[PDB]
């Protein structure tokens, strides 16, 4: 998260950090065994960590649990990052508390202008790297469709959506990766894709959850 702020310790009870030796992307808890995150964050030997806030230091409320099978939607494109979103099954049940929650699937799809929370351990500076201990996070308006395909010519689809700011200075970036993007307490995106971070005129782009209720559950059900 780039022009970000410390969100505070277990203020965000649904983010997940997926970690292989190390956080490389983030999740959504939906339910006590199921994740919700990024197709891209794809790889053998996930272990999900809940209940985080410095990933480099046990502090407490944090539940480790191997991923037990990850399912990429049948129909993401690599190339175009169209149907970026992927379901994490976790080998046992997370233990629900005030810690650690899930959220909730949308119903209707958000409209422009709806204020929402960006969260992640990714990079935190626009010219270089700069990895954060604790969750950062960032208030985002979701922008109108013409302003997303204007700055995106021909790369963006039906099932994404740009949040952000146009001057730049505010954005996700590499290592939110997978993350939420929730509005009004339901989980509207998944921190997908941009060119560069926190670039003007380049706002970041999300994958469009609520198109995907339909095929989560019916996924969930079947697994
Ligand atoms: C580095 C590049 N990822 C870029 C990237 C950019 C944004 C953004 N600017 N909002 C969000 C998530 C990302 O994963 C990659 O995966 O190669
Ligand atoms: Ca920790
Ligand atoms: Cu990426």
């Known amino acids: 998260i780039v022009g970000g702020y410390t969100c505070g310790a277990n203020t965000v009870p649904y983010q997940v950090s997926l970690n292989s030796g190390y ?25 999900v960590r809940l209940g985080e ?9 944090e539940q480790f649990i191997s991923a037990s099978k990850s399912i ?71 922008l109108s469709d013409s302003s997303c395909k204007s700055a995106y010519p021909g790369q963006i689809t039906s099932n994404m959506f740009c949040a952000g700011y146009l001057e730049g200075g505010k954005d996700s970036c590499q290592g939110d990766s997978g993350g939420p993007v929730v509005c009004s307490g339901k989980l509207q995106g998944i921190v997908s894709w941009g060119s560069g971070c926190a670039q003007k005129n380049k706002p970041g782009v999300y994958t469009k959850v609520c198109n995907y209720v339909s095929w989560i559950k019916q996924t969930i059900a079947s697994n």
């Not at 806030?53 to 409320?61: K, L, P, Q």
């Open 23 to 47: 956080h490389f992307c983030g999740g959504s808890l939906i339910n006590s065994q199921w994740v919700v995150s990024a197709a891209h964050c794809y790889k053998s030997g996930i272990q």
């Open 53 to 61: 806030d410095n990933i480099n230091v046990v502090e407490g409320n």
């Open 72 to 142: 990429v939607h049948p129909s993401y494109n690599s190339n175009t990052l169209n149907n970026d979103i992927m379901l994490i099954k976790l080998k046992s049940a997370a233990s629900l508390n005030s810690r650690v929650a899930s959220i909730s699937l949308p119903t209707s799809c958000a409209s422009a202008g709806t204020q929402c929370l960006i969260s992640g351990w990714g990079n935190t500076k626009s010219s270089g790297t700069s990895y954060p201990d604790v969750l950062k996070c960032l208030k985002a308006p979701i």
